[PDB]
């Protein structure tokens, strides 16, 4: 797991994202779709998006980017007790929306790569260690919940 020291980094880095929770998760996602045009395919709602420009001017894609940041923060704020939040994610994930757990790798390192973007140079080595376990963590927990369901 994370050390106390740990957690407090991570959720000192989560700070930033919550003075700008909608902005943040538009850069991922569109960080996302733009290095990995296949994850685009597993939303209906954001397949017509054929340019960068149709990205950044969706407000649905920000509005989404909203609800999938507001879900990693509540699971990051229970630093690795998330059992109860994680569970039903990775159930959906796997059963219904058909997220391979490489995309769940391609959308951490997305993350890096935003806060990076957003905050350089105050995004410290500390902190993208911290933050890089917490991400795995979900990751590796999300990965336990796949095999169960033999879901690949
Ligand atoms: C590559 C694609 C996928 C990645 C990576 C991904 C990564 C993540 C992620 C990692 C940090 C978090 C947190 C996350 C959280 C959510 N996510 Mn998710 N998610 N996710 C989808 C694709 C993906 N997710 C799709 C498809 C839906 C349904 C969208 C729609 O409304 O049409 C969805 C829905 C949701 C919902 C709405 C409730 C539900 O359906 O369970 C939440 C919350």
């Known amino acids: 797991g994370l050390s106390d020291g740990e957690w407090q980094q991570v959720l000192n ?4 994202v919550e003075a700008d929770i909608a902005g943040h998760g538009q850069e991922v996602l569109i960080r996302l779709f733009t290095g990995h045009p296949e994850t685009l395919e597993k939303f209906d709602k954001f397949k017509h998006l054929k340019t960068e420009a149709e990205m950044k001017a969706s407000e649905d894609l920000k509005k989404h980017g909203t609800v999938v940041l507001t879900a990693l923060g509540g699971i990051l704020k229970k630093k690795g007790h998330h059992e109860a939040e ?11 929306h058909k997220i391979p757990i490489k995309y769940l790798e391609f959308i951490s390192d997305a993350i890096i790569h ?6 350089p140079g105050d995004f410290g080595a500390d902190a993208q260690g911290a933050m890089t376990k917490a991400l ?4 590796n927990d999300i990965a336990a919940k796949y095999k169960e369901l033999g879901f690949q």
């Open 86 to 96: 994680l569970k039903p994610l990775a159930q959906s994930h796997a059963t219904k």
């Open 114 to 119: 935003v806060l990076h973007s957003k905050h």
């Open 13 to 16: 880095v989560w700070g930033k």
């Open 136 to 139: 795995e963590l979900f990751r």
